[PDB]
Amino acid sequence: QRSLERLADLLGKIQKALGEYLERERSSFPRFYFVGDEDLLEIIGNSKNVAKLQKHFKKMFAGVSSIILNEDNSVVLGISSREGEEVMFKTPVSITEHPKINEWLTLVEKEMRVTLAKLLAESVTEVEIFGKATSIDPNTYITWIDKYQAQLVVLSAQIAWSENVETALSSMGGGGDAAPLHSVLSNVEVTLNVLADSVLMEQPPLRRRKLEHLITELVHQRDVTRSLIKSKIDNAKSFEWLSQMRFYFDPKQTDVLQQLSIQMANAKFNYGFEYLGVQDKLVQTPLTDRCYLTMTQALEARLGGSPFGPAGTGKTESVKALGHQLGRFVLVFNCDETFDFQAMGRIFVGLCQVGAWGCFDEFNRLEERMLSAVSQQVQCIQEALREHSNPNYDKTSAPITCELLNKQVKVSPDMAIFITMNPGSNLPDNLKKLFRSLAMTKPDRQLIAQVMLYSQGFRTAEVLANKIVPFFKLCDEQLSSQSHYDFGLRALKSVLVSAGNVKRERIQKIKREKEERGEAVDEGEIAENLPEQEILIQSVCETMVPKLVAEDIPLLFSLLSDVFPGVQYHRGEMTALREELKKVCQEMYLTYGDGEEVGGMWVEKVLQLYQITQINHGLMMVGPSGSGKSMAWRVLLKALERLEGVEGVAHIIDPKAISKDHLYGTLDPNTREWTDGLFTHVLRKIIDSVRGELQKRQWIVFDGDVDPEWVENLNSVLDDNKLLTLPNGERLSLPPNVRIMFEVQDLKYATLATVSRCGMVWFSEDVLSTDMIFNNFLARLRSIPLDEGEDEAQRRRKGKEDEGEEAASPMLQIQRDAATIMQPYFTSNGLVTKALEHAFQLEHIMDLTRLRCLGSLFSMLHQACRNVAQYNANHPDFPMQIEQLERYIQRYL
Amino acid sequence: DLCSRVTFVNFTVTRSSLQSQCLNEVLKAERPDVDEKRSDLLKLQGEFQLRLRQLEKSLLQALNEVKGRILDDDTIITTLENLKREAAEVTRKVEETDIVMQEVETVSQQYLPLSTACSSIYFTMESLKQIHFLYQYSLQFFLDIYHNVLYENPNLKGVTDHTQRLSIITKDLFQVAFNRVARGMLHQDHITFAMLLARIKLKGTVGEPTYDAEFQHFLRGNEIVLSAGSTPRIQGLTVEQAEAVVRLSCLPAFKDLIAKVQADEQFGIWLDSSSPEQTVPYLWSEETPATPIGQAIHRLLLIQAFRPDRLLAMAHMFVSTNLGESFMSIMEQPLDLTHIVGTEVKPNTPVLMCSVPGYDASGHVEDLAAEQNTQITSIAIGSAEGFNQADKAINTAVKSGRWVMLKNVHLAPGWLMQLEKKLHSLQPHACFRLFLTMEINPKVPVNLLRAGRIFVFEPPPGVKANMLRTFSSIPVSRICKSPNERARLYFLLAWFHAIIQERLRYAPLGWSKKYEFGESDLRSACDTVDTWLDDTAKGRQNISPDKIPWSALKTLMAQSIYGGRVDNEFDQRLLNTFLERLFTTRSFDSEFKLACKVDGHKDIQMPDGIRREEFVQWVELLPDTQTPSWLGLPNNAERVLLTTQGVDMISKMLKMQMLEDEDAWMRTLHTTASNWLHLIPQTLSHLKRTVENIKDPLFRFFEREVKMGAKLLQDVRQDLADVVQVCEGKKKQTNYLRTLINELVKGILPRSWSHYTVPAGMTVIQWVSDFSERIKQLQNISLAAASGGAKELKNIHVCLGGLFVPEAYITATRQYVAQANSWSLEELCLEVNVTTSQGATLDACSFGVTGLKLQGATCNNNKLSLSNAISTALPLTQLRWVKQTNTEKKASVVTLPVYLNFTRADLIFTVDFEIATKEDPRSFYERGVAVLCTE
Ligand SMILES: Nc1ncnc2c1ncn2[C@@H]1O[C@H](COP(=O)(O)OP(=O)(O)OP(=O)(O)O)[C@@H](O)[C@H]1O
Ligand SMILES: Nc1ncnc2c1ncn2[C@@H]1O[C@H](COP(=O)(O)OP(=O)(O)O)[C@@H](O)[C@H]1O
Ligand SMILES: [Mg+2]
């Protein structure tokens, strides 16, 4: 008893001491409660090899995908974003000098803050230099833009505009002379013209992202300045100007943290300098301005925020954007059967420790017990927050704390908590006295489209946006909605981005043509004389018509003609790929067409599939059983291989026939080793490229229905990163030859998050006609014998004409005669087609299927000609007489 | 199996069981002489025989052991005489097994209506659950009422006559039951409970007829349907009153009502009188002089038919003339909590009290404890330490005889359940009362509501009371702080908060929906004003009225504090007009009118004082009269609210009739199913699709809508066929079938039938009526389109009410004219033209719309004017899509929302109307003018 009790006390005390050391580390650096403790312990155990730690850095930071290492990985060089953007420390910190994880991580964080503050000071200095001039050099502008990171560039532009207009207000000071306001507006207009000219040319993707961000900011600044000039504001303390977010930069502050202060309306916020990599910049519509004002007032009053309303209006995105503009790291909590009560307590402790913004996306989807539990948690932490709000409590010595995990946890006032709701319901009754509420009833899609379309580089944007937004509203109203349809703001943004890319491709094509022939190349001259309506319509067609049911395509075209009058789209012609596709179709025994013919729908569908696989690296096929999606896929692969000279290799994998663990690899709980899964092993094989498959192209089909339970591993591949995350922790990229696929009957049980990451082509069941399938069957009868087995299947790799094999066996002649005699009954209005149409009206014991009936018929006719062959084998004296064959085949048919 | 393996015992309560219980209780309690005679009737059996045989057994035990001493003192002969007397006495009792039985039978027959009334009252109290989830009353509660009436009656003192005792005990029972139930009951339902008790006493009393037909018409007079075009026109009254007379005329005593009202000349001054219930005329036909109760019922039917907004007042009058004028006078008084907590609260029953959200009741009990000099501990129920504090406090107080505060316990239903489980099995002190305070929520345990002395606390209405509550909640020092204009700003904010908060009461006219403008919003507004005033003043004693940040306060209260919950653009605009009218520099003038056009002639002049005490004095000197003109609503808003409360009371008491009266449902289901299959149409016809008609937007909408509507119609007809098949018994039912049948029986709207837009909380009969109207319109448009093609479809007049999505109809006509004129959709704007003419010539861009209604205004020559009518029936409305030219906004243009139904929950489109006179567009917004597609 005593011997067992000693071990019981000792092992528990050792575990408690390890936990106390971990908690001391998390007290030395507050960022540490965010990572799970079971992963933090193996992080400590593997401090020398931080390659495994690289996976945990995504949870560690906001957008820092990995940390840059030295050649001996003992001194950190910097941090990389999700794409690979780097920032450089002034004096790099050595992990060997300070082996403690908490010490070197907090050194990294503090020096990151001070170095981005210093480069921000240099940025605002050079942007002041740029803005003080009437004209700006585009080369110097682009040099600065590529020199400095995207968020710092946008923030520097905001600070420069804010100080310009503030100096304008202080310079008038009741004098009523609008000269400095007009000069600021003219400066912003000139910079907008310069950058709109700049974005037209071809740029690196990061430069393009920065240019989009700066147009998004500058249109808002110009609109604010125009509204202020219209309002005729003469004093800097008027509320018409005070309601807009002012940026106050103080370089004279010795401490870098209190250098930047952001004030909107009344609250005096402070910038928490954190690295965000590259984020998405939301356009400052009046709705988002009102949201910013209300959340700023709520945080000033130290209450909560709860923007309620219908989904897809920008609630959690607006909260995230406000957190980005404030510099706080932002977590978005999924509230759909992904509830982890034990983790959320530690997350809340970390939020109280450092300060981070957490938004509960769709809080109405939880069940009562967890609603009550997390409501009690958010209630106690909100009351802890409000312990700082009261003025009767002193602030010079204020250890504001909360009872979290039965522990006194230090709380800083920097954090914020938001709870998104979706009525249609209300907040729980124990939180209504603490959380403000917002009405996100309707976004300003017209202004969103206008600003995004203007940032794409369009000469005209207002009429195109004011057409395309009611166009999408009209399309959602008039189109018979299905499960995979989406006409939301995300769809609008994707359509406009595709339109900008199409316009840039057109610019490149016309420039290359005019360089090939003899003229003078002028990018602006090419730019002004192009139909933006035609470009946008072509983009809508190319990104939406494949995703559309055959019933809805002429309705969509009629809506397009109603909204954009006097303009029509002419589809581009792909002669080389069409000819190669026709040759491959003739080789592989199919039916081809050239539009509005037999097989013309299939041909234009697979051409649309090529367009989608050129635009995006991941697409789906959502035809029913009997839609030809896999065969169109194979035909396109074999045609592209012959056209480009690049070998096409297929990897068809059934996702649900095999287990998900055997598909994505299985982790070893003991004696740790990695067993590769099917798709992961194929991707590892092409990454290694032992047989030189990086020069060739690989397509991978997941031939089976999609579920949210197994596509969570493919979300990290189907996003813009194209980085397959694995429990091993090693990073696998997707080379451009890889184009992942999906072969699904329907998406009745698939998430819209997985829908949004891929394009889709809807192969309607009226694509393969009965005549088409009859042509395939007759071609297979006339070509493929029925007695050679699989030994001669490898013999097909000789010449495709198969010369000298005409008199290989009399079976080929017999079945050719059979195909000839069954030809008149396989017409468009033939007996088989009429009988199939009539039996469609009848009901059977199972569900009738056209290819099922046809396949049974074809198998029995194969057995009929085999019976003729057996009769001839048993009758070597006389062959099978022609009229007897006529009667037998007719009767058997 | 569990049924077969055990035997069943039912200690259940029913009419006969409670009748016999009350009869036994009243005979044991009140009547002494026949009480003793009937206890002697229970002594007719062999109790004395058993005692005598016990004495005989003792004597026999003392008989065998004898040695010549049984002739001791001649005392045995006394016992022999006693036993002979007892034998003769029980023999006489056996001989009297008819006379005494007849006497006690007559005595019990004297007390039969009293026990019938007791059973009816308890069954109504049990049926009170279906009115509201809060009304949970128990058999122990009713027996407490009965014992308090029978035993502790102060009226019975000094009275010896048995008939007088009967009358006193019946009146006291009714009064005490009404008081005890209504103390824990909302103010909107006191009249309902009083009406039920009056019906019970009218049934139980003798000498008065049943009035069963009158009651049935008074309850379900709107359930019958009138033929279209069968209502004639009668002068001196409106259309709705005409159909009300038509519905009323079915009664045998009301046949000559039309002739009487046509021959009556003084009818106008009564129909337009403020209180027609005082001087209601003589209109009922009768052959004998009716009782006061009968004439009250007849005039109540007359008031309900003619002026439904006075239904509450006339029901009050009927309760007064049936059960006493002082019957309801107890409820119109401050609560006497002292007597209740000292006498009528059991020590093991916690005093349960409830309130509407935003209002507390702890101050009442704090004052009660202060005046009762009893120590009470305050515990807040919001966490585990609060649970432990509650546990230790209750286990201390159960012995020490103290009182326990358990604040806002509605957050923990499981804690409430286990606390009631604890309270079922403890021995409490004689002075231990547990005061549970919580808001009215459905998460409170139903058994906890059943096992508690419930109470209801409500905030009284009236702007004066609202501002008094606001100024009492706001501390004096906050307003007293410098500058001196802070008091005036706080008075303005309090007036505005009271105005909006009591504008909530007149929904949907006051607001499109009932927001929660509670105390947190008031605190946020006060903090905002404090911060901005501090920033502007910077410690100065006095600041100029012009230097006040009016723009800051207006924008913040419009977008952040009060406008945060406002999801409607038009409610946001109304809030904006309120803030622009109130928060301005012009308010600080002595001539500022805080509410214009009050009562049509006067104005509420803003007080000129600069002190909190002066403002509070002005508030306390406010007149007790109040009309919606104080809030800015039209003066008919009170009448609309009163008639809404009247129809709500009628429906609530109709729920009582169909549940408490069960002497069944299949027999009524036969008639309802046959009638519904009768008036519902036969079939609908689809429209043929052609390559030329494929471009018709109304054909596209017709295709989608009529596909889903043919699905809906085949479902409805097939389900009605299934219902009547089950009615005839040759078809069984599945779970879906029985749930649908139960919903059709109870009147709850079928969810599978309801997948298009309908008003909330609406009845299946009205659903059948307006759905048959929609199907008739669809048949008309299908027939016209099939007969004429698509050319006349532009000229066909379409009612927006009968359309399923008139928003899609508006988009259809805009894309139709866009296709016709080859214009972009952005280059089109909508212009409205209300035409009083019938079948006017329509342009190529003009359309026909019927059925529109205008609320709170009148339309004349496309120009609006303020009107005192509740609703005006708009004539044929024209929708013209002109090109969106660069036209400036006129000073007399107004944008009106067009809601589909009266609830104003959904929005369709907006119109553009002119103004005839120079009435303020702010006045239009304050009055709340809106357009309704259907009434
Ligand atoms: N162009 C074509 N001409 C004639 N027949 C064709 C053509 N394309 C496909 N088929 C026939 O259609 C059949 C079904 O097509 P495919 O093999 O692509 O599968 P699918 O219908 O998409 O099935 P699933 O739902 O299982 O993915 C093929 O087996 C082939 O016989
Ligand atoms: N101001 C804006 N600018 C650009 N896109 C926006 C803006 N507001 C919302 N969106 C888009 O609308 C979508 C809303 O999604 P999200 O906010 O995540 O869900 P919910 O709206 O249900 O909270 C996002 O995909 C976002 O891209
Ligand atoms: Mg396939």
Q: How far off is chain B from A196, nearest CA to CA, in Å? A: 26
A with B: how many residue pairs have Cβ under 8 Å apart?
86
Nearest-ligand number for the alpha carbon of A292: 2
The whole-angstrom distance between residue B594's C-alpha and the CA centroid of its chain comes to 33
What is the torsion angle, in degrees rounded to the nearest 10, for the CA atoms of residue A271, residue A276, residue A277 and residue A282? Answer: -90
What is the torsion angle, in degrees rounded to the nearest 10, for the CA atoms of residue B554, residue B558, residue B564 and residue B569? Answer: -170
Which atom from ligand 2 is nearest to the alpha carbon of A310? 22
Name the nearest CA neighbour of A84 among A683, A733, A617: A733
Do B303 and B311 meet the contact criterion of CB atoms below 8 Å apart? yes
Do A507 and A535 meet the contact criterion of CB atoms below 8 Å apart? no
SS3 readout for A64-108:
CCEEEECCCCCEEEEEECCCCCEEECCCCCECCCCCCHHHHHHHH
Do A723 and A716 meet the contact criterion of CB atoms below 8 Å apart? yes
Phi then psi for residue B433, to 5 deg, are -125, 130
Round to whole Å and give the CA distance between B596 and A116: 60
DSSP B669-695: HHHHHHHHHHHS-S---PPPP-TTGGG
Pairing of strands B456-457, B602-605: unpaired
Round to whole Å and give the CA distance between B174 and B153: 13
Contact A558 B695 (CB under 8 A): yes
Contact A239 B520 (CB under 8 A): no
Q: Which chain B residues are closer than 8 Å to A467 by Cβ?
A: 824-826
B839 burial level (CB within 10 Å; 0-12, 13-18, 19+): exposed
Measured CA angle at B39 (ends B37, B45), to 5 deg: 105
Ligand 2: centre distance to CA A490 (Å)? 7
Round to whole Å and give the CA distance between B504 and A299: 28
Experimental technique of record = cryo-EM
Contact A562 B559 (CB under 8 A): no
Contact B560 A240 (CB under 8 A): no
Nearest-ligand number for the alpha carbon of A744: 1
Q: Is B411 touching A (CB cutoff 8 A)?
A: yes
Ligand 3: centre distance to CA B501 (Å)? 64
Round to whole Å and give the CA distance between A43 and A40: 5
Q: Which helix (H) or strand (E) holds A331?
A: strand A330-333
Residues whose beta carbon lies within 6 Å of some atom of ligand 1: A 590-591, 599, 602, 623, 625-631, 743, 745, 768, 772-773, 775-776
Ligand 3: centre distance to CA A841 (Å)? 27
Round to whole Å and give the CA distance between B248 and B835: 35
Name the nearest CA neighbour of A351 among A297, A315, A405: A405
Do B790 and B693 meet the contact criterion of CB atoms below 8 Å apart? yes
DSSP B779-842: HHHHHHHHHH-SSTTTTSEEETTTSS-HHHHHHHHHHHHHHHHT--GGGEEEEEEE--SSS---
From the list B383, B564, B824, which residue is nearest A439 (CB)? B564
Mutant choice from B534, B536, B555 vs A, greatest count of A C-beta within 10 A: B555
Contact A380 B383 (CB under 8 A): yes
Do B627 and B868 meet the contact criterion of CB atoms below 8 Å apart? no
Pairing of strands B433-439, B351-355: parallel
- With b for 16 or more beta-carbon neighbours within 10 A and e for fewer, the B430-440 pattern comes to eebbbbbbbbb
**Cα→Cα distances B14→B116, B119, B177, B660, Å:** 12, 8, 19, 12
Round to whole Å and give the CA distance between A685 and A690: 8
Q: Which helix (H) or strand (E) holds A246?
A: strand A246-249
Do A474 and B825 meet the contact criterion of CB atoms below 8 Å apart? yes
Please enumerate, as own/partner, the contacts of A23-29 that have beta carbons within 8 Å and a separation of 24 or more: A24/A102, A25/A100, A25/A101, A25/A102, A26/A102, A26/A350, A26/A353, A27/A353, A28/A100, A28/A102, A28/A103, A28/A106, A29/A102, A29/A105, A29/A106, A29/A109
Chain A residues with CB under 8 Å of a chain B CB are: 238-240, 242-243, 265-266, 290, 293-294, 297-298, 301, 303, 309, 376, 379-380, 429-430, 432-433, 436-439, 441, 463, 466-467, 470-471, 474, 477-478, 480, 555, 558-559, 562-566
> Where does residue A654 fall: left (phi above 0), alpha (psi -120 to 50 degrees), or beta otherwise?
beta
- Classify residue A437 by its DSSP letter: -
Q: Cβ neighbours of residue A629 under 8 Å, at least 6 residues apart?
A: A621, A623, A743, A761, A763
Q: Cβ neighbours of residue B761 under 8 Å, at least 6 residues apart?
A: none
Pairing of strands A401-404, A407-410: antiparallel
> Where does residue A671 fall: left (phi above 0), alpha (psi -120 to 50 degrees), or beta otherwise?
left
Q: For residue B706, give both structure tokens.
A: 């009529």
Q: Which helix (H) or strand (E) holds B235?
A: none
Q: For a pocket test of ligand 2, which of A489, A497, A719 has the largest count of ligand atoms closer than 8 A to its C-beta?
A: A489
Residue B49, helix vs strand vs coil: helix
Which atom from ligand 2 is nearest to the alpha carbon of A287? 1
Measured CA angle at B684 (ends B679, B690), to 5 deg: 165
Q: For a pocket test of ligand 1, which of A765, A776, A778, A854 has the largest count of ligand atoms closer than 8 A to its C-beta?
A: A776
Contact B382 A290 (CB under 8 A): no
Ligand 3: centre distance to CA B590 (Å)? 84
The residue type of B809 is: Y
SS3 readout for A262-290:
EEECCEEEECCCCCCCCCCCCCCCHHHHH
Q: Which helix (H) or strand (E) holds B893?
A: strand B893-899
> Taken in order B278, B280, B281, B287, is the CA torsion positive or negative?
negative
DSSP A667-734: E-SSS--EE--HHHHHHHHHHHTTT-TTSSEEEEEEBS---TTTSTTTHHHHSSS-EE--TT---EE-
Q: Cβ neighbours of residue A375 under 8 Å, at least 6 residues apart?
A: A428, A430, A431
Do A701 and A738 meet the contact criterion of CB atoms below 8 Å apart? no
B492 burial level (CB within 10 Å; 0-12, 13-18, 19+): buried
Which atom from ligand 1 is nearest to the alpha carbon of A628? 18
Do A848 and A828 meet the contact criterion of CB atoms below 8 Å apart? no
**Angle between the N-to-C axes of helices A489-516 and A445-455, in degrees from 0 to 180, rounded to the nearest 10:** 20
Q: Which chain B residues are closer than 8 Å to A436 by Cβ?
A: 524, 560, 564
What are the beta bridge partners of residue B829?
B882
What are the beta bridge partners of residue B849?
B798, B877
Looking up tokens 């575990």 gives A15
Looking up tokens 């203007």 gives A454
Pairing of strands A76-80, A86-88: antiparallel
DSSP A640-667: HHHHHS--EEEEEE-TTTS-HHHHH-EE
Round to whole Å and give the CA distance between A780 and B289: 103
DSSP B459-499: ---SHHHHHHHHHHHS-HHHHHSSSTHHHHHHHHHHHHHHH
Q: Cβ neighbours of residue A161 under 8 Å, at least 6 residues apart?
A: A184, A188, A221, A247
Q: What is the CA radius of gyration of chain A?
A: 33
Q: For residue A303, give both structure tokens.
A: 């209450």
Ligand 1: centre distance to CA A604 (Å)? 16
**Cα→Cα distances A37→A25, A350, A839, Å:** 11, 13, 65
**Cα→Cα distances B652→B123, B305, B647, Å:** 16, 18, 8
Q: Cβ neighbours of residue A165 under 8 Å, at least 6 residues apart?
A: A181, A184, A225, A228, A241
> Where does residue B758 fall: left (phi above 0), alpha (psi -120 to 50 degrees), or beta otherwise?
beta
Q: Kindly state the greatest CA–CA separation across chain B.
A: 140
Round to whole Å and give the CA distance between B729 and B726: 5
Q: Which chain A residues are closer than 8 Å to B564 by Cβ?
A: 294, 436-439
DSSP A790-850: TTTTGGGGS-TT-TT-TTS-HHHHHHHHHHHHHSTTSSTTSHHHHHHHHHHHS--SS---H
Looking up tokens 């002075």 gives B431
A442 to chain B: closest CA residue: B567
Q: Is B524 touching A (CB cutoff 8 A)?
A: yes
Round to whole Å and give the CA distance between A117 and A845: 74
Report the nearest-CA residue for atom 23 of ligand 1: A625
Round to whole Å and give the CA distance between B535 and A151: 33
Contact A565 B411 (CB under 8 A): no
A540 burial level (CB within 10 Å; 0-12, 13-18, 19+): buried
Round to whole Å and give the CA distance between A441 and A432: 20
> Where does residue A688 fall: left (phi above 0), alpha (psi -120 to 50 degrees), or beta otherwise?
alpha
Q: What is the resolution of this structure in A?
A: 3.3
Question: CB A791: neighbour CB atoms within 10 A?
Answer: 7
Q: Which chain B residues are closer than 8 Å to A439 by Cβ?
A: 563-567
The whole-angstrom distance between residue A34's C-alpha and the CA centroid of its chain comes to 25
Do A410 and A352 meet the contact criterion of CB atoms below 8 Å apart? yes
Q: Is B441 touching A (CB cutoff 8 A)?
A: yes
Pairing of strands B893-899, B907-915: antiparallel
- What's chain A's length in residues? 893
Looking up tokens 């170095």 gives A115
Which atom from ligand 2 is nearest to the alpha carbon of A315? 23
Measured CA angle at A606 (ends A738, A849), to 5 deg: 110
Q: Cβ neighbours of residue B456 under 8 Å, at least 6 residues apart?
A: B134, B183, B184, B185, B186, B187, B353, B354, B355
- Residue A283 Cβ inside 6 Å of ligand 2? The answer reads yes
Round to whole Å and give the CA distance between A777 and A819: 9
- Residue A448 Cβ inside 6 Å of ligand 2? The answer reads yes
A293 to chain B: closest CA residue: B560
Q: What is the CA radius of gyration of chain B?
A: 36
Residue A396, helix vs strand vs coil: coil
The residue type of B617 is: Q
The residue type of B158 is: G
DSSP B521-569: HHHHHHHHHHHHHHHHHTT-S---STTS-HHHHHHHIIIIISTTS---H
Q: For residue B331, give both structure tokens.
A: 């409820």
- With b for 16 or more beta-carbon neighbours within 10 A and e for fewer, the B692-704 pattern comes to ebeebbbbbbbbe
Q: Is B536 touching A (CB cutoff 8 A)?
A: no
Q: Please give the annotated binding residues of A, written as ranges.
A: 309-316, 623-630
A309 to chain B: closest CA residue: B567
- Residue A309 Cβ inside 6 Å of ligand 2? The answer reads no
> Taken in order A82, A87, A88, A94, is the CA torsion positive or negative?
negative
Which atom from ligand 2 is nearest to the alpha carbon of A452? 4
Question: What are the residue ranges of helices labelled H in A133-242?
Answer: 138-147, 150-172, 179-200, 205-231, 239-242
Q: Is B547 touching A (CB cutoff 8 A)?
A: no
Residue B856, helix vs strand vs coil: strand
Residue A7, helix vs strand vs coil: helix
Nearest-ligand number for the alpha carbon of A652: 3
Q: Which helix (H) or strand (E) holds A419?
A: strand A416-419
Contact B819 A466 (CB under 8 A): no
The residue type of A284 is: Q
Q: Is B808 touching A (CB cutoff 8 A)?
A: yes
Ligand 2: centre distance to CA A489 (Å)? 7
Which atom from ligand 1 is nearest to the alpha carbon of A630? 18
Q: Cβ neighbours of residue B729 under 8 Å, at least 6 residues apart?
A: none
**Cα→Cα distances A503→A90, A458, B169, Å:** 42, 9, 94
Round to whole Å and give the CA distance between B763 and B770: 11
Q: Which chain A residues are closer than 8 Å to B810 by Cβ?
A: none
Q: Please give the annotated binding residues of A for ATP, written as ranges.
A: 309-316, 623-630
The residue type of B863 is: K
- What's chain B's length in residues? 935
**Angle between the N-to-C axes of helices A150-172 and A205-231, in degrees from 0 to 180, rounded to the nearest 10:** 20
**Cα→Cα distances B62→B51, B59, B67, Å:** 17, 5, 11
Phi then psi for residue A703, to 5 deg, are -80, 85
> Taken in order B252, B258, B264, B269, is the CA torsion positive or negative?
positive
Round to whole Å and give the CA distance between B591 and B588: 9
- Please state whether the peptide bond connecting residue A624 to the residue before it is cis, i.e. omega within 30 degrees of 0: no
DSSP B700-765: HHHHHHHHHHHHHHHHHHHHHHHHHHHHHTSS---HHHHHHHHHHHHTPPPTTT--S---TT--HH
Name the nearest CA neighbour of B121 among B5, B213, B19: B19
